[PDB]
Design goal:
This is part of a larger assembly, with one copy of chain A (343 residues), one copy of chain B (386 residues) and two copies of chain C (119 residues).
Chain A lengths: L4 E6 L5 E8 L2 E6 L4 E5 L5 E5 L6 E6 L3 E5 L4 E4 L8 E3 L11 E2 L4 E2 L7 E2 L9 E2 L10 E4 L3 E5 L4 E2 L19 E6 L4 E6 L4 E5 L6 E2 L11 E2 L2 E3 L8 E3 L5 E2 L13 E4 L3 E4 L7 E4 L3 E4 L7 E6 L5 E5 L3 E6 L8 H12 L5
Antiparallel strand pairs in A: 1-31, 2-3, 3-4, 4-5, 6-7, 7-8, 8-9, 10-11, 12-13, 14-15, 15-16, 17-18, 18-19, 19-20, 21-22, 22-23, 23-24, 25-26, 26-27, 27-28, 29-30, 30-31
Chain B lengths: L3 E4 L20 H4 L21 E2 L4 E2 L8 E7 L2 H5 L2 H5 L6 H8 L8 H14 L5 H15 L11 H13 L6 H9 L3 E4 L3 H11 L25 H4 L2 E2 L7 H5 L9 E2 L5 E3 L6 H5 L10 H23 L1 H4 L8 H14 L7 H18 L17 E3 L1
Parallel strand pairs in B: 5-6, 5-7
Antiparallel strand pairs in B: 1-4, 2-4, 3-4, 8-9
Chain C lengths: L1 H14 L14 H9 L9 H26 L10 H7 L5 H13 L4 H5 L2
Helix pairs in contact in C: 3-5
Classes of the chains: A mainly beta (343), B alpha/beta (386), C mainly alpha (119).
PDB class: protein binding
Keywords: ALS, FTD, GTPase, C9ORF72, smcr8, WDR41, GAP, GEF, protein binding
Entry title: cryo-EM structure of C9ORF72-SMCR8-WDR41
Amino acid sequence: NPYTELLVLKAHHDIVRFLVQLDDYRFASAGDDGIVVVWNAQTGEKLLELNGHTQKITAIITFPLILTASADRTVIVWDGDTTRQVQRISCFQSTVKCLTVLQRLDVWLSGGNDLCVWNRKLDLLCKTSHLSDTGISALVEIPKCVVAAVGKELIIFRLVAPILEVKRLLDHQDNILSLINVNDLSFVTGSHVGELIIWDADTQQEIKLCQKISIHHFTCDEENVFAAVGRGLYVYSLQMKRVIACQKTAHDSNVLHVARLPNRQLISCSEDGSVRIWELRELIGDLIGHSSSVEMFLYFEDHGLVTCSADHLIILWKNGERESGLRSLRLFQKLEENGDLYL
Amino acid sequence: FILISEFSDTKVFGTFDLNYFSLRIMSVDYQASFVGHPPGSYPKLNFVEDSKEGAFAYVHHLTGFVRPFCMAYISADQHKIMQQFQELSAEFSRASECLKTGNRKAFATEYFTQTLAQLSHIEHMFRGDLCYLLTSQIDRALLKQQHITNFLFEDRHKKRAGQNALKFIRQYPFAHPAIYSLLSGRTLVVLGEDEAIVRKLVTALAIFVPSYGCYAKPVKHWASSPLHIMDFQKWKLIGLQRVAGTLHALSRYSRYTSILDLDNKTLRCPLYRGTLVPRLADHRTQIKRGSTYYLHVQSMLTQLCSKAFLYTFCHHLHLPTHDKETEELVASRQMSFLKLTLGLVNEDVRVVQYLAELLKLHYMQESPGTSHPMLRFDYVPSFLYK
Amino acid sequence: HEHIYNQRRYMRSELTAFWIFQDVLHRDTLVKAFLDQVFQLKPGLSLRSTFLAQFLLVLHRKALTLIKYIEDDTQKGKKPFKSLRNLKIDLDLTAEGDLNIIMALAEKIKPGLHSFIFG
Amino acid sequence: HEHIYNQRRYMRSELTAFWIFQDVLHRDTLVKAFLDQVFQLKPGLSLRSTFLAQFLLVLHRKALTLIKYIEDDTQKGKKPFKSLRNLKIDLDLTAEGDLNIIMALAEKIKPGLHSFIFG
């Protein structure tokens, strides 16, 4: 409803899958080209391409530095304002698939069929495991410091010391497709068949929900949780322990990324290339701008939201009544700065 | 109709049409020996009447024995040649310098075609009339005066453009909202096969488009592509073709189009109920020879761009006169400006609301749609007209 | 047209020797709009001269399309004019007091119109 | 004419079940003249009602001569209308915003004009 202007961005020539915010005027789009071009969210000008990976991408992250793994068995550490490769870590026998960074003890992690703890500046190892046979598909942090991980269909935990443990748990029915933290005291996973199960933190398994085709993504709204099942938006609570009113048909094809604006609005991706906004107490408006399947988005609080797809394009979404009163705000500054009007 | 020739004490050669038919009847020998030197005549140049009208008579010398040689003009009336003495003096006092600082070299025919091409350029640039040259001087000086708003519609193929614009408007129903979509910022996706019809419709409707900057046009002639939103960014009217589909997959982008169908006689754009487009384009018009109509539309769009200049550069509208700005106050104050003073009604406020934004983007960085691809739109529901 | 005609009357009738300010008829719309909306721009920032040149541009272009429309209404002076009303509704000139400005500039850079259409 | 037409649209499209204030276009001249020159007479001396009845009289007589002029322009509804411009210059109705008053009263005591001339 408010977003009435869009500036399409184009630098890639493969499927764009990943976005991350660096600081609050610029972001980075990393697709299956293996190139990482940073953009400017205020005015949509590309700044610099970070090229050097050969194969497709698997996971990017921002370290307070742009650490990036790919399908070839290597990780390239990068940085803003440089356009140079900082390091070329290639010591992996399988493809690294997770780069979840602990914000507490400045640790960078990996996922390439094992777990290896790394270092901040003097970029060395700290500890190596094997503990897998398929490939680790999800990582998350949790307090009391314990690091959760999915082997294939088993939640296995860790610990940190100046050095880890095993705290296997399995109790499942299919391989785990998603994993999320909450504010504190819990964490939520979801099986491929649609079994939404909540744990606490560790602590005990809590609910073994049914009735919801295949789940894709979660969203913390700690009084309730927001699932993303096949063309559905089934909402599950925490206090009431039941399904607060859901939407059996939200999108046409699928729902494959959900997130939440801070102004009590709910937003989802799709597979036909459609973005929609819901209010809790339902639909508000479309954001029809992509041909093929959208994949991820990101929401700048000051200026607009950014969406990517498998059609190589990246689209900013500004509003036309707040970003038009800034064109005629820099104009009168420039006019009285210039003195005359033609000089 | 008018003639141009040489002198010496007789005719040397004609230059206008090289001794043509009954358009040329009167002898050059009547003009000859009366435009030479009966006082005897260094660079003499004079002007007489001799009631055709006597004209510019720059006297030139060759020192060599063949000294009397002046080049002479003639036209219809008096004040065409007397009133334009300043632009007939300094274009034959410099075209003779090819011959003067030409054939002054060979006494101590190489520059002959130089004079016989420069002189043809003089008659071609002074071919028209006395009124047309004065209007082109005034339009030249005034387009030198304004410099912001000229790019919006600054752009004899304009005769073929405007004549097909008139044959568009008075021979196609519901064209008021189509031209509203062109003037408002909505991409008129002209769709239909039989290429030449679509191309003539495109070059006819190309007049109404407010181009982005001081580069040529955002028009696209007969694209054949699925048209995702990157061609809707860089082109404001597009000439798609039918393939015997695209109408169903194109309607997914229904927020940014006005799909005018040639083989179906329908279009899909919002409702236009305003008065500015009917005075730009009335249904019945008693205007003949549509180049006149193109002058009418250019005269009207100049006034429209003046209204957009006014709405852009008023300080007390855009700068908020409050500590904390409230968009109810500044939006209602802008709306009170375009209703009361400019006299606009319910969609023309959207038109001037757009052209002002193009004017801001030209003045601020001289780059809309190249390094700032804005593409502002709205959620107004388009209706399927039939 | 009455000035040229009465000029011919007074010159002839003063060459046969030894062989009046009537007030403003009615106002207009373009100069009322122009003077209405100029004094909202700022004085010393070269805006009023720009908008003034835009106003003189639309005045001269309306003059030239009036010249073209008379010039092709008849066969460039073959037939008498007889076409003032459609000229006034088509060319946005329904006020006669605003017709007189464009008609005066059109006479000023094409002489002989007022005798052709009025006299 | 759009009100009757869209009335037919909404009534039909609500009878097939189980088988918007757009602001003032432009102003006028008679009501501006009338309201200009009424408040110079005196209030309590029965003058304003007299002049008001004269204004309603010229409104209704302009309505009746508009009805007559449409009524004999075509052969009382044989041919389509096609004659708005000469109707506007002859009957002192060059402003459309002052045409709409006389046309509205003419519709009010002769129904079916707006569909005949506009739709």
